[PDB]
């Protein structure tokens, strides 16, 4: 996020010194990149005690929320985002068959 600004700036300088007839090459405001809400990604009953076919419905609801970005009650989207590989954390106490 912060590291990209460097890359962008060096690349802008090349077009600037190359072409002077066209001046003031546009840039976006800093908050376009700083703001995290703009980008797509950003009372809990104990599931262990539940019946099976209700765990299935709950997990489906959380996954349907997961698909569009942010995570859900029983499954979390890990905030590491190291390198470029996103990872997710399912609740530990589930049925192994559902979990895989």
């Amino acid at each position: 996020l912060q590291q990209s600004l460097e890359l962008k700036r060096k690349m802008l300088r090349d077009k600037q010194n190359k072409k002077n007839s066209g001046q003031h090459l546009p840039i976006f405001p800093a908050w376009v990149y700083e703001r995290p809400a703009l980008i797509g990604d950003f009372t809990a009953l104990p599931i262990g005690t539940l019946p099976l076919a209700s765990q299935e419905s709950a997990v489906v609801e959380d996954l349907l929320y997961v698909l569009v970005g942010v995570d859900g009650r029983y499954v979390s989207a890990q905030p590491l985002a190291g390198r470029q590989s996103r990872t997710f954390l399912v609740d530990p106490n589930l049925d192994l068959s559902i979990r895989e």
């Binding site: 049925d95 192994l96 068959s97 979990r99 895989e100």
Partner: peptide, 29 residues
Amino acid sequence: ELVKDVLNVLIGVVSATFSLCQPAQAFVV
């Protein structure tokens, strides 16, 4: 009742298993 598992054993599940392993030594169902 147990048959529900078997229905999903047709697909990959954990109730029954496909341990990616040597047949019948660690490979199991």
